[PDB]
Amino acid sequence: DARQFLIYNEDHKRCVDALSAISVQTATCNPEAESQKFRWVSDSQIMSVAFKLCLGVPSKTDWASVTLYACDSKSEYQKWECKNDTLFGIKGTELYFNYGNRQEKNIKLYKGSGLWSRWKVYGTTDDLCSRGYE
Incomplete structure (x- = not known):
C-alpha cells in the first residue's frame, strides 16, 4: 500500500509511532510496524x-500535544499542510x-522551524504531501 507511509525526521533518524489515542511518540523506524504507518x-x-484515528491537537497553541482524534473533515484541529523544504x-x-x-516524548506543536519541525516520507527525500492529494 504505497498510500501508507512512515513519517521520518532526518536529524533524529526516527519515525513517528502511534502508541494510543492520547500518545504519539517516535521510534526507530520499522516499515513493518503498523503503529508507525500513516x-x-x-x-x-x-x-x-493502526488506530483509524487522525492526527490532531486540542488547540492551535505552542507546545500542544499532537495525538489522535476521531477523523472529522469539519474539525480545524486536525488539518495539516506542507510548508517549505519539508x-x-x-x-x-x-x-x-x-x-x-x-526531553518530551510526544510530538508537539512548536513555533520553531528548524530541523526538528522537518519531516519526510520515510525512504524518500520528499515531504509528507508527496503521499497526499491536490
Whole structure:
C-alpha cells in the first residue's frame, strides 16, 4: 500500500509511532510496524493506520500535544499542510509538527522551524504531501 507511509525526521533518524489515542511518540523506524504507518484521508488529514484515528491537537497553541482524534473533515484541529523544504505544520498557522525539545516524548506543536519541525516520507527525500492529494 504505497498510500501508507512512515513519517521520518532526518536529524533524529526516527519515525513517528502511534502508541494510543492520547500518545504519539517516535521510534526507530520499522516499515513493518503498523503503529508507525500513516495515510492521508483528505487534502488536510493524516490518519494512523493502526488506530483509524487522525492526527490532531486540542488547540492551535505552542507546545500542544499532537495525538489522535476521531477523523472529522469539519474539525480545524486536525488539518495539516506542507510548508517549505519539508517543514510540516497546522494548516493556516505557523505552528509546526515537532520532536526533540525538552526531553518530551510526544510530538508537539512548536513555533520553531528548524530541523526538528522537518519531516519526510520515510525512504524518500520528499515531504509528507508527496503521499497526499491536490
